[PDB]
Amino acid sequence: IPSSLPVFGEVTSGELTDRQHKTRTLKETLEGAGLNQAITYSLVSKDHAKDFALQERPTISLLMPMSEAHATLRQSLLPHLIEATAYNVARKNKDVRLYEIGRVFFGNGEGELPDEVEYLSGILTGEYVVNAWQGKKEEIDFFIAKGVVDRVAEKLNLEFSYKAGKIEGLHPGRTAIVSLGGAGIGFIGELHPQVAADNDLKRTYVFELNYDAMMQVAVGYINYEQIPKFPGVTRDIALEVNHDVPSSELKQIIHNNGEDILQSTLVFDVYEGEHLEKGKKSVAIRLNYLDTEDTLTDERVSKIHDKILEALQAQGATI
Amino acid sequence: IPSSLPVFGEVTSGELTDRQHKTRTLKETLEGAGLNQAITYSLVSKDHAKDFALQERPTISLLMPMSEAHATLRQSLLPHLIEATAYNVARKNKDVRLYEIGRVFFGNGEGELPDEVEYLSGILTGEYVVNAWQGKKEEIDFFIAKGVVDRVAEKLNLEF
Amino acid sequence: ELMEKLNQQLAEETIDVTLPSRQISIGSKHPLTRTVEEIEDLFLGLGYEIVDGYEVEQDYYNFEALNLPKSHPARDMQDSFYITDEILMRTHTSPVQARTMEKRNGQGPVKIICPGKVYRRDSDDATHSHQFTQIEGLVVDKNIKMSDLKGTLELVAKKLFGADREIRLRPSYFPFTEPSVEVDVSCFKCKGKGCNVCKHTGWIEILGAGMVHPNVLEMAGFDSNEYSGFAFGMGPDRIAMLKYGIEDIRYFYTNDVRFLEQFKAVEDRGE
Amino acid sequence: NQQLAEETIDVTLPSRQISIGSKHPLTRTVEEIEDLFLGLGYEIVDGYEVEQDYYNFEALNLPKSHPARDMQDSFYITDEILMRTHTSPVQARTMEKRNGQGPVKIICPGKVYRRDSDDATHSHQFTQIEGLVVDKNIKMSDLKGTLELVAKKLFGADREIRLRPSYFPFTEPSVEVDVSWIEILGAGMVHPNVLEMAGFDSNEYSGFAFGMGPDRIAMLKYGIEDIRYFYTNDVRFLEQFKAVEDRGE
Ligand SMILES: O=C(Nc1cccc(S(=O)(=O)N2CCN(c3ccccn3)CC2)c1)Nc1nccs1
Ligand SMILES: O=C(Nc1cccc(S(=O)(=O)N2CCN(c3ccccn3)CC2)c1)Nc1nccs1
Numbered sequence: 001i002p003s004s005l006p007v008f009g010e011v012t013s014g015e016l017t018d019r020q021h022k023t024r025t026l027k028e029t030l031e032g033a034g035l036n037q038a039i040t041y042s043l044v045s046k047d048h049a050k051d052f053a054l055q056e057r058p059t060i061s062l063l064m065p066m067s068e069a070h071a072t073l074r075q076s077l078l079p080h081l082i083e084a085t086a087y088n089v090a091r092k093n094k095d096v097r098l099y100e101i102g103r104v105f106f107g108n109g110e111g112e113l114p115d116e117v118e119y120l121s122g123i124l125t126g127e128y129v130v131n132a133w134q135g136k137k138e139e140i141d142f143f144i145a146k147g148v149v150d151r152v153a154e155k156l157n158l159e160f161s162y163k164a165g166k167i168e169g170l171h172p173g174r175t176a177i178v179s180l181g182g183a184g185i186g187f188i189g190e191l192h193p194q195v196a197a198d199n200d201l202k203r204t205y206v207f208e209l210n211y212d213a214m215m216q217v218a219v220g221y222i223n224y225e226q227i228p229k230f231p232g233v234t235r236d237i238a239l240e241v242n243h244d245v246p247s248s249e250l251k252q253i254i255h256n257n258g259e260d261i262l263q264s265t266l267v268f269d270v271y272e273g274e275h276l277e278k279g280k281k282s283v284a285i286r287l288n289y290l291d292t293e294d295t296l297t298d299e300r301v302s303k304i305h306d307k308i309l310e311a312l313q314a315q316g317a318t319i
Numbered sequence: 320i321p322s323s324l325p326v327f328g329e330v331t332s333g334e335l336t337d338r339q340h341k342t343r344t345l346k347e348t349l350e351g352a353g354l355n356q357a358i359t360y361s362l363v364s365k366d367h368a369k370d371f372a373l374q375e376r377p378t379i380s381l382l383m384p385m386s387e388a389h390a391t392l393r394q395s396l397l398p399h400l401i402e403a404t405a406y407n408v409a410r411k412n413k414d415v416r417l418y419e420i421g422r423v424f425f426g427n428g429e430g431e432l433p434d435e436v437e438y439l440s441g442i443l444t445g446e447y448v449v450n451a452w453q454g455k456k457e458e459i460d461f462f463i464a465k466g467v468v469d470r471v472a473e474k475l476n477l478e479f
Numbered sequence: 480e481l482m483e484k485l486n487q488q489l490a491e492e493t494i495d496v497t498l499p500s501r502q503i504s505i506g507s508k509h510p511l512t513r514t515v516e517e518i519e520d521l522f523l524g525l526g527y528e529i530v531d532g533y534e535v536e537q538d539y540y541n542f543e544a545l546n547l548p549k550s551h552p553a554r555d556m557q558d559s560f561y562i563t564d565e566i567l568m569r570t571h572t573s574p575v576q577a578r579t580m581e582k583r584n585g586q587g588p589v590k591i592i593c594p595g596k597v598y599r600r601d602s603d604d605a606t607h608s609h610q611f612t613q614i615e616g617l618v619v620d621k622n623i624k625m626s627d628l629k630g631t632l633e634l635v636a637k638k639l640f641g642a643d644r645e646i647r648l649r650p651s652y653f654p655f656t657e658p659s660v661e662v663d664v665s666c667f668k669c670k671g672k673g674c675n676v677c678k679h680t681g682w683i684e685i686l687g688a689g690m691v692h693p694n695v696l697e698m699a700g701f702d703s704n705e706y707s708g709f710a711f712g713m714g715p716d717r718i719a720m721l722k723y724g725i726e727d728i729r730y731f732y733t734n735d736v737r738f739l740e741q742f743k744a745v746e747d748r749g750e
Numbered sequence: 751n752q753q754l755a756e757e758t759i760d761v762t763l764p765s766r767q768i769s770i771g772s773k774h775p776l777t778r779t780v781e782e783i784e785d786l787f788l789g790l791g792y793e794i795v796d797g798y799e800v801e802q803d804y805y806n807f808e809a810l811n812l813p814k815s816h817p818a819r820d821m822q823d824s825f826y827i828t829d830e831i832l833m834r835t836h837t838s839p840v841q842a843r844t845m846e847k848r849n850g851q852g853p854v855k856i857i858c859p860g861k862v863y864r865r866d867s868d869d870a871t872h873s874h875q876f877t878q879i880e881g882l883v884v885d886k887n888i889k890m891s892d893l894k895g896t897l898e899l900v901a902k903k904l905f906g907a908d909r910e911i912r913l914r915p916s917y918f919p920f921t922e923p924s925v926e927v928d929v930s931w932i933e934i935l936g937a938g939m940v941h942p943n944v945l946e947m948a949g950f951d952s953n954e955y956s957g958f959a960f961g962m963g964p965d966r967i968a969m970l971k972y973g974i975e976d977i978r979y980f981y982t983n984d985v986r987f988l989e990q991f992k993a994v995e996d997r998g999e
C-alpha cells in the first residue's frame with residue numbers, strides 16, 4: 001500500500017469552534033496565573049458522589065465497580081481535587097494550585113442518559129508569591145481565590161457577582177455563591193476547617209463553576225469606548241454600619257443614587273476595632289465620578305454626592 | 320461570479336512553524352503576567368537610533384524623512400517603549416507594563432540590506448499587585464523585572 | 480540640589496542582581512492535554528472538525544452502531560462499565576463519530592477528530608487505568624482509500640515523534656473496520672537497531688486504524704457503494720509515556736505537582 | 751463555634767486581582783486571519799521589512815517608469831533599497847524559491863511603510879496581511895470564495911459585502927471588496943508577468959492574491975477614531991482588548 005492523502009472537494013477551513021477556542025484561551029489564562037491543569041477520575045465513592053452538589057439530583061453508580069472508590073460518577077470535581085491536594089501536601093508539596101475542566105454527572109431517572117455538565121474548578125493552598133530574601137510571602141486567602149475566579153470572568157468578558165452562601169464542606173464564613181446574569185453558577189470558598197483537618201491541610205480554597213452556563217453566554221465582539229476626554233472627580237467616604245452589612249449593599253445604594261456621573265466605587269479600607277461602637281464596622285469607599293461629555297463642576301458632583309450620602313444615612317450608614 | 324474554493328491536490332496540514340508557535344505561546348505568557356502588547360514605530364530620531372545598542376553598528380537612515388522623529392531605524396526597542404511610558408505617566412496612568420517583540424536594524428553598509436533582528440523587550444513601572452483594603456501594594460522593582468525574564472526563559476525552556 | 484541627589488542615588492543604590500528574582504509562577508498544561516492539542520492542530524490544518532460528545536453512552540452507539548451485535552465478546556459486562564443493561568461508560572470515542580456520522584444524513588465529507596476520556600473495567604497498575612484518554616478520527620468521503628489512511632497516519636507519527644518518523648502497518652482485526660491494521664512508528668530514540676523504548680525492535684505500536692466497515696456506514700445512513708471511510712484511534716496516555724519515558728500510567732491521574740510542573744515549557748524538534 | 755464566627759469574611763470585598771495583559775488589537779486581527787488560513791492548508795510566511803526595489807516593485811509589475819516607485823511616496827534609503835510598501839515582496843521571494851513548482855498558498859503579515867504625513871487615518875508605518883495562491887487551475891471564483899471566507903471571519907457571516915471590479919498592476923482581473931459600503935480587501939488574479947518573472951509558467955499556473963489592512967479593519971470593527979492610537983500604547987487603549995470574543999447572539 002502506497003501512501004497518499006485524501007483530497008476533499010467540499011472545502012472547509014478547519015477551526016476550533018468558539019467554545020473550543022475560549023477553552024484553550026481560558027486554560028492559558030489559568031496557567032498564566034500559576035495553576036496546574038489537573039486530570040482526575042470521574043468515578044468516586046458512592047458517599048462522595050454528592051459532595052458539593054448544588055441540586056439534589058440523582059447519582060449514577062456502576063453495576064459492577066472494580067473498586068469502592070470508583071463506583072459512582074461525581075457530581076463535583078472537588079472531591080478528587082481535594083484528595084490530590086491532601087496527597088501533595090502529605091508529600092511535603094505545600095504549595096498546590098490546580099484547576100480542572102471536567103464533567104459531572106446527574107442522573108436522569110431510570111434508563112435515560114444522565115445530564116453531563118462541564119465544570120471549571122480548582123483548588124489553592126500555600127503561598128501565592130514568595131521571595132524570602134525580600135520578605136515577600138503572600139499566603140493564598142479567599143480573596144486571591146476570588147481573584148482567580150475574577151480573572152476567569154475578565155478573560156471571558158463576563159461579570160460574576162458574589163453573595164455569601166452556605167455549602168456543606170466549606171467554611172460557613174468564607175463561602176461565596178458566584179452568579180452570572182443573576183443565576184448561581186458555582187461558588188468559591190475556603191474548605192471547612194474540619195474537612196481541611198481531616199486531609200491534614202492548611203487554609204485551602206476551591207472554586208467550582210458551571211462552565212456550560214458560562215459558555216452559553218454570547219459575548220460578541222469587544223466594546224471599544226474612546227478614552228474619556230475629561231478628568232473625573234474622586235470623593236472618599238467612611239461609612240459606619242453594622243458589622244454584617246456586606247459591602248455590596250453599600251455599593252448598590254451608591255450606584256442607585258449616582259445618577260449619570262457615578263462611574264465606580266471601590267472599598268479601600270474596612271475598620272473593626274475599639275475605636276468604634278462594638279458591632280459596627282467602618283467601611284471606606286472611594287467614589288469615582290465621570291461625565292464623558294463634560295467637565296465636572298464641584299457643584300454638580302456635590303449635588304449627587306449629597307443625594308448618595310442621604311440615601312446611605314437613611315439606610316443606617318453614618319458618616 | 321460563481322463562489323468557489325480552490326482544492327489543492329497537493330495536500331498539507333496548515334500549521335504554525337515551531338518558531339511561530341513559541342511566539343504565540345510566549346506572548347500569552349507575557350499577557351498572563353500582566354504585560355500589554357505594545358506596537359511602536361520602527362523609525363526614531365537619528366539621535367536615538369543607537370541608544371542601548373549592544374552592538375556598535377551603523378544605523379540605517381532614510382533619504383527623505385517626513386519627520387525628524389522618524390528619520391532612522393531603531394537599534395533598540397526601548398526608546399519608543401520609554402517614550403510610551405512617559406506618555407502614559409504624563410496622562411496619569413502610573414502603572415505601565417508593556418512588552419514588544421519587533422525588529423531593530425543594523426547597517427551592513429554599502430547598498431546592502433541591513434541585518435534585521437527580532438528583539439523581545441518591555442518596560443515596567445508602578446504597582447504590580449494591589450488590594451488596598453487588605454494593605455497589599457507590591458511595587459515593581461528590579462526583581463520583578465527579573466521574574467518576567469525568568470518566566471520567559473522558564474516558558475521557552477531556556478537557561479539564562 | 481538635583482545633581483546631588485542623583486549622585487547619592489548612584490552611590491547608594493547598587494544591588495546584587497544575581498539575587499533571586501521575584502517569581503511569577505506558570506502552571507502546567509497536563510501532558511495528556513498537550514498531546515491531544517498537537518493532534519487537533521495537525522487535523523485542523525487539514526480541514527477537520529474537533530467533536531466532543533457523551534462519556535456515558537448507550538450500547539447502541541458504543542457497540543451496535545459500531546458493528547458489535549448483541550452477541551460479541553466485547554459487549555462483555557465484565558470488560559466494560561455498565562450502569563444498566565443498555566447504558567455504559569463509553570469504551571472508546573467512536574460512538575461520538577457514529578452519532579455525528581448519522582446526523583450527516585448520508586452526505587460527505589465527514590472528517591472529524593474526537594479526543595476524550597474512555598473507560599475500561601480493569602484494575603489499575605503501572606500500565607492500566609480504568610479511565611484513560613483516546614483520540615479517534617473518522618474520515619468518510621467518496622473515493623477514500625487505504626493509501627489515504629496511510630498518508631494521514633504518517634502525518635500523525637511525524638507530528639508526535641518527529642519529521643523523520645516512518646510508520647509500519649500490520650494486519651489485524653477490529654469489528655468496525657476492514658481492512659484493519661495496527662500501526663508502529665519507527666523509534667525516535669535509536670535511529671535503527673533497537674533500544675529499550677522500542678524493545679530492540681525499531682518499531683513502536685501507537686495507533687490502530689482501518690477502512691470503515693460497510694455495516695457501520697450503512698447503519699449511520701451512508702451508502703457504502705458510493706462512500707468509503709477510514710478511522711483510527713490512539714492513546715495519549717501511552718503516547719506520553721513512550722514520548723517522555725513516563726513509567727506508570729497512574730502518574731497522570733495523581734496530580735503530584737512535582738510531576739505536573741515538569742511540563743511547563745514549549746517544545747521543538749531539536750536537531 | 752466562635753472560631754467560625756470570628757473567621758467570617760465579607761466575601762463581597764475586592765478580590766486580589768491577578769492582572770491580565772492585552773494582545774494588541776492589530777495582532778488579534780492578524781492571528782484570526784492566520785488561523786483561518788492555517789485550516790485551509792496555507793503557510794504563514796515572514797520576510798524582510800527593508801527590501802530591494804526589484805522585489806517591492808519590479809517583481810510586482812511596476813517597472814522603473816511607474817508612479818508607484820515615486821521617491822515622494824515611499825521611504826527610500828538608497829535608490830535601490832526602501833522600507834517595503836506592502837508584504838508582496840515576501841510573496842514574490844517565496845514564489846521564486848519554489849522554482850516553478852506549486853502549489854503556493856501563503857499568507858504574509860507585517861509592517862509596511864508609506865511616505866506620508868500621519869493623521870487620524872494615515873500612519874507612515876501600518877500593518878498589512880497579503881495572501882497568494884498559485885496552482886494549476888486557479889480561477890477567480892476560487893478568489894471569490896476565499897474572499898468571502900475572510901469577510902465572514904472578520905465581520906461575521908451575515909455581514910453584507912460588495913465586490914467591485916477594479917485594477918492593480920500586479921493582478922488582472924482585479925476586485926475590491928466593501929463591507930456594508932466600506933472598502934477592506936483588494937485582490938485579483940495574479941498577472942502573468944508576475945508569475946512569469948518569479949519563474950512560474952502562466953500557461954500552466956494561475957494565481958490569486960489579496961491584501962487587507964488590520965489597522966483599517968480594526969478601526970472599522972471597533973470604531974477606533976484615530977489610527978495613531980494603535981502606535982501610542984496608552985494603557986487605557988490596550989486594556990480594552992483583554993477579553994475573548996465570540997460571533998455573538
Ligand atoms: O473505527 C473507529 N475507530 C478505530 C478504528 C480502528 C482502530 C481503533 S483503535 O486502535 O483505537 N481501537 C479501539 C477499540 N479497540 C476495540 C474495540 C472494540 C472491539 C475490539 N477492539 C481496538 C483498538 C479505532 N471509529 C469509528 N467511529 C465511527 C465509525 S468507525
Ligand atoms: O497581488 C498582490 N496583492 C494584492 C493584490 C490586489 C490588491 C492588494 S491590496 O489591496 O493590498 N493593495 C496594496 C497595493 N496597492 C497598490 C500598490 C501599487 C500600485 C497600485 N496599487 C493597491 C492595494 C494586494 N500581491 C502579490 N504579491 C506577490 C505576487 S502578487
Ligand SMILES: [Zn+2]
Pocket residue numbers: 666667668669670672673674675676677678679680681
Ligand atoms: Zn529504539
